[PDB]
Every structure is written in structure tokens, then in C-alpha cells.
């Protein structure tokens, strides 16, 4: 039981990062203009507080679908020993998130000279160490283990080398800071290709797709311009590895070399230079390459590049609105926005799969331990198919899983003894199995009794799990798995 949005320490970590570095102006004289949104001023429009918070949320999301995929039973990457990102302990995630707050705390300006890059990261590491040593009592005993681990995370932040693919604490920081820079990179398909390939190697296609879609939702909730996906764009593709392009070999293929034990090798990198008929590769040309379009599912797909709704003029009104500068100058507000975005991205795939009175309805009951284990198994097996799809729509699989495995439908076709207060379930039966019910749109006959309510679920309204949670132990000394369901107007 731990997340970014309710921490009071990672929250204070980001608060310190905003109070000392993220909220302080750029001083490098390279794109140092503080933007003016409404009446409010933002210093680090590109790499400010919103950037840090999106990075932390990406860390949580990447690890979350990592364990999600592990529950699905597919194959993840390896960190030089049998383990994967899914094996990240929650306190290790807390350590990573406290590290990520200062990962950009040393950017004097956007300039990306390699020497200047190293200097910025050295300053970031020094600031991180100065912060931890300032709140040392509350972080080294519990959050971290010893000063050596704080030094290890300082090493990862400063990153003198470039071996991001070494430890989970390396990936969930470098990938998180890298995939955030999709909102600004102008040729979209190239960068998204590079990040998708670089992160799928760790987790898998479906989970990476989910991460990128929820990233789009994060962008929307933080008033950041969302890049459109043009699978047939005629712009010349550039490889994000370094900065180069792909010149064609004048007939139908680029410069192709040959290794030992192989007839052909992939595309050869050259610097942007003189052509001639030695043209470059267009983005559309790059995407439909049979060697790369068999692993990148977005080949041939397109995205809105904006809110599916309000027009470009209104969208531009929204981007420059006050809330853009509010997310940049309030840790609490931006964390709240991200949390609601995460909840919506967690419950909206369910509505996506199935075409379509208070909201929260806790309903506690006492169950045997073996039954709770056998029920959490078959509820996580239903949560672990609701990946928020972005390119490949996998609705039939999750719909069939929900329909056929109707073992968590043992709450309908009968009355109920529900309420809408957590304590009122803790304070009366103190049950070991709570059934929280999320239903924002009708679908429940939440009639009052009198306080508390009493619900009745029709046949054409199903309940689908959302996030199985373990909340401490009961009065009599056993674990209290507080589930969470969502109500689906399912005509099927």
C-alpha cells in the first residue's frame, strides 16, 4: 500500500525541489525567458515542476504495468540476474521517486552540450545530497538503508557513464526522464519509435502501449500540448540514437552492411550531409520498413494530437490558461491533477471495453483466508487485462476474460448492506474484505436507509475490479484486503 499521490515525504521532496531549484529561475542565458501564462509567471516552462511530477508518475506507471505484465505471465527483461522491473519493492520505488525529484534540479538552461550536460547533472547530484543530508533523520533509517545507498542514487542521478540499462533504479529514472520529452520533439514518429523500442525490451508491447497512452492522458491533465501521431508523414526520419538520418542506397534500400553469420544488416547511420539519388528516408518510409514494423504496433495508426473535442483555438486557450501556470507553481495542485488523471486512466479502459445516489459505496464482509487468496488470484487475473490501449485495440480478450470468469459476481441478484464511510465498515464489523464500489454515473439504486445506503445491482449492470488493495490488519489480527469495483452498464 503505497503510491506517489499520497506520500507526505516524496510530496515534501518535490516541494523542496520546487522551493530551491524547480521554482527558481534559469540562470544560463540559453532560452531563459520565463513564460507568462495568464497573470502568472513560469520560470522552467520546459523542465519545471510539471516535468518532475510527470517523471515520477511515469516511474510509478512503468513499474505498475511491469508487475501487471508479470501477472499476465509474459517475459520481461533481466538486470544481469533473474529479476525484472516488476520486482521493484514499494520502498525502492519511494527511493527512486525521491531521487527523480532533483534529476533536473541542476538545469541552468535547456542547452545540451555534453560537458554542460555533465555539469548540470553534477549540480543536480550535489543538490540531492544536500537535501538528503538536511532531512537525514527521516530518510536514511527508513526510506534508505545507509549513506552508501544515498551515494548510489546520487551516482545514478549524476550518471557519469551512460549505462541506463544496468539496474531498475537506472531504467525507471532514465526512461522516465526520456519518454517525457515527446511533447516537444517535433518529428513525433521517430522519437516515439525509439522510446517504444527502448522500453518494450524491459516490459512488453501491451504494457508499453498502456504507458504511452496514460502518458498522453497525463499531458492532457497537466495542460501540455500533445503531439500527433502521423504514421504516413513525409518528413525525413532521423534516428534518435545520437542525431543522424538514414540515406537510401539509391534503389530501394538504405546503406546496408553485412555481419558475420548474417547476409544483411540493418540501416547504417550517417550524419546529415550531401545527397545524390542518395535521398534520405521519410518518416512514412521508416515506419513501414518490414524489419521494424513487425515489432512496433503503431505502424499504420494515427492519433488525434489533441483533445478529441474542443477545437484548436479553444485548445490553445486552454494551454495558455492560468491552470498551466498553477501546475507549475503548486506541488499539491499538480499532484492532484495527476492523481485524478491516473484514476480516470485506470477506470476508463473498462468503459472502453464495454459500450455504454452517491459514488463510493463500501460494503464489508468477513471471508476465510483461503477464499480471499483464491479470490484475489481471480481478481488480479481480471485486472491484468485492462491495459489502456493506444494503438492495438484488445477489447475482445479482456471482454471475454470478464464475461467467462464471473466469479466476482457474487454480490448481485440480492440486496445489500452498504454504506459510504470507510470507518463505518472499520468501526462495526471491521471486516477483513471490503468491497468499495466506484460508480459515478447512475447504475446503482443507492437508496438511503434512514447515514448509510442499500444498493441493488440489476442484471445488466456488472462489477469489474479496479485495484486490489491490502490495508493493514483487522481488530482480530488478520489482513484486510480492501478491493475496489467499478459499475459497468453491460448489455452483454
Amino acid at each position: 500500500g503505497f503510491s506517489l499521490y499520497t506520500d507526505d515525504t516524496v510530496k515534501a521532496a518535490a516541494q523542496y525541489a520546487y522551493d530551491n531549484y524547480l521554482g527558481k529561475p534559469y540562470t544560463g542565458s540559453v532560452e531563459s525567458a520565463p513564460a507568462n501564462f495568464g497573470g502568472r509567471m513560469v520560470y522552467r516552462q520546459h523542465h519545471g515542476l510539471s516535468h518532475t511530477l510527470r517523471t515520477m508518475a511515469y516511474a510509478e506507471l512503468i513499474v505498475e504495468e511491469a508487475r501487471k505484465a508479470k501477472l499476465r505471465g509474459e517475459t520481461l527483461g533481466k538486470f544481469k540476474d533473474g529479476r525484472t522491473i516488476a520486482d521493484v519493492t514499494p520502498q525502492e520505488l519511494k527511493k527512486i521517486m525521491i531521487a527523480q525529484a532533483f534529476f533536473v534540479a541542476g538545469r541552468d538552461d535547456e542547452a545540451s552540450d555534453a560537458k554542460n550536460y555533465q555539469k548540470y547533472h553534477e549540480q543536480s547530484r550535489d543538490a540531492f545530497l544536500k537535501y538528503v543530508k538536511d532531512n537525514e533523520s527521516t530518510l536514511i533509517p527508513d526510506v534508505f538503508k545507509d549513506q552508501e545507498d544515498v551515494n548510489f542514487y546520487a551516482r545514478v542521478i549524476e550518471d557519469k557513464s551512460h549505462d541506463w540499462e544496468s539496474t531498475p533504479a537506472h531504467v525507471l529514472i532514465n526512461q522516465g526522464h526520456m519518454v517525457d520529452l515527446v511533447r516537444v520533439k517535433q518529428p513525433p514518429e521517430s522519437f516515439l519509435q525509439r522510446y517504444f523500442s527502448s522500453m518494450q525490451r524491459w516490459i512488453g508491447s501491451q504494457a508499453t502501449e498502456a504507458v504511452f497512452g496514460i502518458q498522453r492522458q497525463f499531458f492532457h491533465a497537466t495542460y501540455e500540448v500533445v503531439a500527433g501521431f502521423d504514421s504516413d508523414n513525409k518528413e525525413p526520419h532521423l534516428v534518435v540514437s545520437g542525431l543522424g538520418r538514414y540515406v537510401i542506397g539509391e534503389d530501394g534500400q538504405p546503406i546496408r552492411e553485412a555481419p558475420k553469420k548474417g547476409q544483411k544488416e540493418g540501416d547504417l547511420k550517417v550524419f546529415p550531409q550531401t545527397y545524390k539519388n542518395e535521398r534520405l528516408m521519410r518518416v512514412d518510409e521508416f515506419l513501414k520498413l518490414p524489419e521494424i514494423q513487425n515489432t512496433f504496433p503503431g505502424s499504420g495508426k494515427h492519433l488525434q494530437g489533441g483533445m478529441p473535442g474542443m477545437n484548436e483555438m479553444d485548445y490553445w486557450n486552454r494551454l495558455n490558461s492560468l491552470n498551466r501556470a498553477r501546475c507549475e507553481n503548486d506541488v499539491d495542485f499538480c499532484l492532484k491533477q495527476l492523481q485524478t488523471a491516473h484514476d480516470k486512466a485506470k477506470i476508463e479502459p473498462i468503459k472502453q471495453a464495454f459500450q455504454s445516489p452517491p459514488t463510493r459505496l463500501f460494503r464489508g464482509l468477513n471471508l476465510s483466508e483461503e477464499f480471499t487468496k483464491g479470490l484475489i488470484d481471480q481478481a488480479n487475473a481480471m485486472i491484468a487485462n485492462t491495459t489502456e490501449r493506444l494503438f492495438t485495440d484488445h477489447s475482445p480478450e479482456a471482454f471475454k476474460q470478464i464475461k467467462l470468469n464471473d466469479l466476482s459476481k457474487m454480490s448481485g441478484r440480492t440486496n445489500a448492506s452498504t454504506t459510504t464511510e470507510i470507518k463505518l465498515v472499520k468501526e462495526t464489523w471491521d471486516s477483513n474484505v471490503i468491497f468499495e464500489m466506484l460508480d459515478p454515473d447512475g447504475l446503482l439504486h443507492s437508496k438511503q436507509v434512514g447515514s448509510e445506503f442499500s444498493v441493488y445491482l440489476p442484471e445488466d449492470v456488472a462489477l469489474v475490479p479496479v485495484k486490489v488493495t491490502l490495508d493493514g490488519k483487522t481488530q482480530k489480527g488478520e489482513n484486510r484486503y480492501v478491493f475496489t469495483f467499478v459499475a459497468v452498464k453491460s448489455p452483454d
Binding site: T6, P141, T340, K426, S451, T469, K476
Partner: protein, 739 residues
């Protein structure tokens, strides 16, 4: 000259001539048995000690978080130093030794801080828990993990109600010290354990666990108090030549009249439904208060009565014709050809209610200061007012609903909140309508007031889970409040006073910000109102406990955040929030609440009004939901917990000073270390940032050194050296600011 005719004292119990603790359900008489607090807590502490022993002998010590082991060891040291038996203290320290070894071995920095705590105070666990480790219940976690023998129903209920923190199993001196220090400046304590789905507030559980510890108060009124001294009937030795040429208006049921001396003569007719007794009690109470203005140091310009007699209904009806709302007043008076009139003389401002929108903010601050000062002075005297504003458990609104009910968790919707304080008994010049007062004893006895309004508290609490199927009774920690209900209703009265202050200020703000357009000016008005409310809570604390006003205000602002109270009062008390649609409302709630879950409702807003049930008056909270003002409720609980915790801490401080003085006079001839431990405890049980208590303890430490010369002072040189340095600094600033 200045002193209060009522005095506080202890009693065996309030459980005299209450409703029998039996609940009637469809022909079943269920007896309601209390679960004793101070015994279940002690049994839990004993189980904790046994489980610590089982931990140490289990060698699983390496499988606990280092901060959790630090908490265990610190609590063991503090509990040992709270005990008096040699056997028990030696057992506790022999339990704490292996944990000390483990800390000094594995985690040298944690131990470096722990020894700093141990040499700084005698109960270290209260300085180690002025932060968000208090939400970590190490006690209960250990009891659940290692004590495998199941808890009885009493311990189960105690754990279930008090699972929030681990400061709920402390003995009375340690817990009271911790509660008083949690308000200290260097404390980051916030009674909110926000986990990923709950946001458990337990600011009321602290107060409940404090009250369940106190010993039942009773207030003894002097013989010549107003409710004990009795005076004869009131003679009609003065008849007012009542003349329609000088009427100004009709305030409810009161005719106003001018005076060539700029004063105002009011005539209150007998309101329909009540007898002449009410008018004479009002007359006598007003005369008594005006007689003891110097003694009480009461600030209100009080209405000097002139007489109370009867006049023919024809004369009243004939003089009232030249008015505006004649018909309403005609319907308010009683149906009788002769009616009872009470005549008093009051300044003109005595009738403009406190929340009248035609007074500048400075005058509002002055009048609110006067009214709060006077309410709480007259509460010290023993005169409570239960009908300041008709905020209509039997219909009355309980400001502290969590303490006064079984399974009530948040405050209640103040239905028609702006209607409630429309005719409030608080006026721009002071207090008014003193007639329906009620001697304080009516909370500490089973009066008709207490029987009518708080029947649930006195009858004990029932809920189907409280029923023990074997014994056939309802065993509840709530039923124990039968013995203690006087303290609960006392605190509820204070919270009601401050809630009415808040609603009056909020009505003022709502009425003034309609006629103002520049949003900075509106938010300046609301910020001044939030300041006035916090200052009124500080004044309540200063009057009730003697804590200086500035220090009380600081101890509040540590607990109830002033800016969120600003934003919630400015937001939910004006119709302006009804214009916004759903999403804009969502984003504005994100700003007002700012770190804690938003107020969620499903009812539909009526435009230009907001939340409502009739559709034309504004509620403070959706139907059948809690009040949306959190920081007001946090302020009320902070105020009442400060008052009661200071009283209980001072009780403990004197209970320990007696033990110290029985040593320095040889009445208990023991070793030197016993006396030094006594003085160390006597130091730790002083109010936060209260210097003179520490100075007194320092004097006693010097005397103990003088009596026991050859004793080692190595373990007590640090804190008392700091106290000596602070005292020297104090006198230095005194001399420096003297010039």
C-alpha cells in the same frame, strides 16, 4: 474584587439519576455495559510488554524497520521511567536493554539521535512522535504480529476504536504530555493518515481518548451565585409612558423607543407559548450581571432593566400600528387581552445584530472580541447559553458530534445556516436575550436540557455489533461516557459557542461580498474574517486555561491551517460557487482543500443559491452529508482539545509536584535517583513553551541537589543546564527591553 463564583472539582461520577443504561428494541431490553478505559489500556500495555519479550526471545529482531525498533525502545524507556514499582521498572528496562544493544550496533546514527532524545526529556517517546511517525502504530503492530493469544472483546473494542495511532496506549502522563507537545512549534503533527484510499482523520479521536481518561468534573456554585441566591418578586414601581411618537421599529417581538439621552428603551412583550417566568428570569439575570460587571470584567454594554409588568393588549396593539411589519409582530405576541412586558434600556447598537452588513471590519473585530470574551467569562461563572442561535439529538446541532454519539464521524450539515444566525443573540455591542440561560450544573446533572438534547450520550450507546451474544449485553467504550458526560457536554458547549461565532462571521461575509466586485477586496474581507475566527478561538483558550493569547493562537495555527479555512469559508459561504459547472468546481475544490480529499456530493445546485433542500436558502453541506468546512471542524477540535489537554496536563503536573514535595520534605525517604527521576518527570510534564513551570522545576532541582549533595547529576545536567541558560536569557531580555 475579580473572581468567579463557581469552582471546579472532582467527583465520584456523574451517573446519578440518569436514564437506566438499557436500550429498548421491539420488546427486548438490552443492557448497556461500559468497557472501562484505564483498565483495558493497561491490559494492552501489559500485552505489549509480553509481546516485546516474545520478540526479543524470538530473535526476529532483524525483521523490523529501524525506526520502528527505535520507537519500541524509546517507548519502553519512557514507560519504565513512568512506572514507580522497582520490579516493573526493572522488568521494563531489562526488556529495553537488548533493543538498545541492537540500535547502538546496527544503526549508529539512529542511536545517536535516540540518546539525544533520552538526555533531553524523561519521556523521549513524546519528542520522537511529534511527526508523522505517530500515525505508525508500532504498539498494535507488534501486538498483532507476536502476541498470538486472541484478545478479549474489551481489548478488541479498544483496539478497533483506537487503531489510528500508538499514542493511544500511553499512560495518562505520557499521553497528556504528548498531546500538549503535538501543538508545539517544532511539531509537524497532523492527525491525518492519508493513505491511497482513506485519508483517515482522527482529530476527534485524540479528544475522545483524552476525555475517556479524565476524572469526572463537577462545578460547585457559590451560595450567593445567581442560581443559588434567591430574590423576591419584581415590583411594577415604574410605568413607561409608552408613546407612538417615539417608536423606531419592531425587532422581532420587541418594540423600540427613542430617548432624548440617545439611549434606546425596548419593550419585549410576552412571546406566545411561555409564561411570565421567562421575563422575570431575564430581568433578574440582567440585573445580576449589571450588578457584577466589575467582578466578572464583562465587556458587553449590558441592558439596564427598568421593570417587568403587564399592560393591556389594546395599548400594545394601538401603539404598534405605525410600523412596517405590524402583522408579523401581531402574530408573535400571545393571545390575551393582557400581556407581560419586560422593559429594558440598551444602547442603539444593542439591536443591530453582530452580522449586520453595515459595520466596517474593525468594528466587527471589536464586537466579536467583546462577545467571545463575554460568552466565555460567563461560562467560567457557570452560566451557559444553549440558544444563542436556533441551529435546528432531538433537532439540536451538536458541534462535537463525534464525541457525543456512537459511530458518527464528521460534523453535520448546517441546514439553512444563514437563516439560523439571522436573529442570533449576539449583538454589535455585546450579548442579548440573557433570559434563556442555564446554570452550568445542568450539564453535570440529568436536567431536562441534558435529558432532552443529549439522550444518546446519557443512555449509553447501542449498535448491533456492540451486542455480546454470550453475555447478552452491549459492551461499549461509549457507555463509559455515562460517568463522564459532563466533560463532553462542557466541550460541546464551547464548540457550539465558537461554531455560532463562525456562522455569524460567515453570514457577515456573505452579506458584504455581494456588494463588492474586485475579487482581491472580497478575499481581503474573507481573510480578515478567518483571522477574527482564529483570534476568537485563541481568546476562548486564553480565558478558559490562562494560556496567553499569542501562544494559544500559535498552538492553533500549528493545528488548523488558516489558509485552507480562508478558502473554505470564502468558497462554501457565498452563492458564487453555484455559477461554476462541474469541472470548474472540481478545480476550485482542488485549490481550497489543497492536500486532502475534496467535498464530494451528488445533489443538484440551484443557481444563485448553491446547495439547498428547499431551493431558496443555502446549506453548509449537501443533504445527508457532512459539513464541507473541514478546517472549521479542525479548529473547533483543536480548541477544545487544547483546553481539556491543558487542564489534564496541569492535573498531572500537580499530581507529580505532590510526589516531588513528599520527597524533599523526607516523607518518602528513598535514594537520590528516585528524587532525580521525580524531578525529571516534573520537568517533562510542563506546558510547551511555558517557561515559569520549567523555572519552578529548576528551583526544585536545585533544592534536590542541596538535599542530596553526593548524588551524581550526570544524566540530569543537560536539560537543566538548558533550562538555566533559558532562564538567564529570559532575565537578560527583561532587563534589555526594560529600557
Amino acid at each position: 474584587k475579580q473572581y468567579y463564583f463557581a469552582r471546579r472539582g472532582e467527583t465520584s461520577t456523574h451517573d446519578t439519576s440518569l436514564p437506566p443504561p438499557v436500550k429498548v428494541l421491539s420488546g427486548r431490553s438490552i443492557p448497556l455495559k461500559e468497557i472501562p478505559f484505564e483498565t483495558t489500556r493497561n491490559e494492552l500495555v501489559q500485552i505489549y510488554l509480553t509481546s516485546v519479550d516474545q520478540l526479543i526471545k524470538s530473535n526476529k529482531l532483524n525483521s523490523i524497520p529501524s525506526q520502528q525498533i527505535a520507537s519500541h525502545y524509546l517507548f519502553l524507556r519512557s514507560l519504565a521511567n513512568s512506572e514507580t514499582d522497582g520490579i516493573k521498572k526493572n522488568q521494563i528496562l531489562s526488556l529495553a536493554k537488548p533493543l538498545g544493544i541492537y540500535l547502538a550496533s546496527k544503526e549508529p546514527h539512529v542511536w545517536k539521535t535516540i540518546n539525544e532524545l533520552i538526555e533531553k526529556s524523561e519521556y523521549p517517546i513524546i519528542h520522537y512522535l511529534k511527526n508523522n511517525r505517530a500515525h505508525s502504530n508500532f504498539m498494535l503492530a507488534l501486538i498483532h504480529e507476536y502476541h498470538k493469544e486472541p484478545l478479549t472483546k474489551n481489548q478488541s473494542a479498544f483496539v478497533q476504536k483506537f487503531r489510528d495511532s500508538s499514542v493511544f496506549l500511553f499512560p495518562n502522563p505520557i499521553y497528556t504530555a504528548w498531546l500538549a507537545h503535538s501543538y508545539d512549534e517544532d511539531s509537524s503533527f497532523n492527525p491525518m493518515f492519508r493513505e491511497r484510499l482513506s485519508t483517515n482523520f482522527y482529530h476527534s479521536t485524540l479528544t475522545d481518548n483524552l476525555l475517556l481518561r479524565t476524572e469526572p468534573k463537577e462545578v460547585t456554585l457559590s451560595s450567593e451565585h445567581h442560581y443559588k441566591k434567591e430574590k423576591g418578586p419584581i415590583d411594577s414601581s415604574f410605568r413607561y409612558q409608552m408613546s407612538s411618537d417615539r417608536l423606531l421599529r419592531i425587532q422581532g417581538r420587541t418594540l423600540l423607543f427613542s430617548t432624548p439621552q440617545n439611549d434606546v428603551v425596548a419593550v419585549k412583550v410576552q412571546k406566545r407559548g411561555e409564561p411570565k417566568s421567562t421575563l422575570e428570569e431575564e430581568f433578574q439575570m440582567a440585573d445580576y450581571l449589571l450588578k457584577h460587571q466589575s467582578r466578572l470584567d464583562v465587556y458587553s454594554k449590558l441592558p439596564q432593566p427598568l421593570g417587568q409588568y403587564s399592560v393591556k393588549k389594546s395599548e400594545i396593539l394601538e401603539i404598534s400600528r405605525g410600523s412596517l411589519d405590524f402583522e408579523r409582530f401581531k402574530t408573535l405576541i400571545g393571545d390575551s387581552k393582557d400581556l407581560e412586558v419586560y422593559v429594558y434600556k440598551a444602547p442603539l447598537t444593542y439591536f443591530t445584530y453582530l452580522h449586520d452588513k453595515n459595520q466596517d471590519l474593525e468594528d466587527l473585530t471589536a464586537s466579536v472580541k467583546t462577545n467571545v470574551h463575554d460568552l466565555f467569562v460567563l461560562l467560567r461563572e457557570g452560566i451557559m447559553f444553549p440558544q444563542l442561535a436556533d441551529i435546528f439529538d432531538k433537532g439540536r446541532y451538536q458541534a462535537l458530534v463525534q464525541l457525543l454519539n456512537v459511530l458518527q464521524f464528521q460534523l453535520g450539515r448546517i441546514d439553512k445556516w444563514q437563516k439560523a444566525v439571522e436573529y442570533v443573540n449576539l449583538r454589535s455591542s455585546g450579548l442579548a436575550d440573557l433570559g434563556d440561560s442555564l446554570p452550568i450544573t445542568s450539564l453535570f446533572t440529568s436536567s431536562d436540557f441534558t435529558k432532552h438534547y443529549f439522550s444518546a450520550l446519557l443512555t449509553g450507546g447501542y449498535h448491533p455489533t456492540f451486542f455480546d451474544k454470550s453475555s447478552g449485553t452491549a459492551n461499549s467504550l461509549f457507555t463509559g461516557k455515562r460517568r463522564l458526560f459532563g466533560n463532553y457536554l462542557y466541550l460541546n458547549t464551547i464548540a457550539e459557542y465558537l461554531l455560532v461565532i463562525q456562522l455569524t462571521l460567515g453570514s457577515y461575509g456573505d452579506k458584504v461580498t455581494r456588494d463588492m466586485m474586485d475579487k482581491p477586496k472580497k478575499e481581503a474581507v474573507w481573510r480578515e474574517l478567518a483571522n477574527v475566527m482564529f483570534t476568537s478561538c485563541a481568546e476562548a483558550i486564553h480565558i478558559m486555561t490562562g494560556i496567553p493569547q499569542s501562544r494559544a493562537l500559535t498552538l492553533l495555527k500549528q493545528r488548523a491551517n488558516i489558509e485552507k479555512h480562508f478558502r473554505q469559508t470564502q468558497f462554501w459561504m457565498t452563492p458564487d460557487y453555484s455559477k461554476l459547472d462541474e469541472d470548474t468546481l472540481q478545480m476550485e475544490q482542488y485549490s481550497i482543500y489543497s492536500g486532502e480529499p475534496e467535498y464530494e456530493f451528488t445533489d443538484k445546485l440551484v443557481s444563485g443559491v448553491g446547495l439547498s433542500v428547499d431551493g431558496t436558502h443555502q446549506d453548509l453541506g449537501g443533504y445527508n452529508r457532512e459539513s464541507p468546512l473541514r478546517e472549521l471542524e479542525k479548529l473547533l477540535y483543536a480548541t477544545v482539545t487544547l483546553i481539556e489537554g491543558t487542564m489534564q496536563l496541569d492535573k498531572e503536573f500537580f499530581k507529580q509536584l505532590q510526589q516531588v514535595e513528599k520527597i524533599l520534605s523526607g516523607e518518602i525517604k528513598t535514594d537520590a535517583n528516585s528524587c532525580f527521576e521525580a524531578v525529571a518527570q516534573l520537568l517533562d510534564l510542563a506546558r510547551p513553551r511555558c517557561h515559569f513551570q520549567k523555572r519552578l522545576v529548576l528551583s526544585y532541582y536545585e533544592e534536590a541537589k542541596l538535599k542530596y549533595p553526593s548524588a551524581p547529576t550526570d544524566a540530569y545536567d543537560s536539560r537543566f543546564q538548558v533550562v538555566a541558560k533559558t532562564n538567564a536569557a529570559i532575565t537578560i531580555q527583561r532587563f534589555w527591553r526594560e529600557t
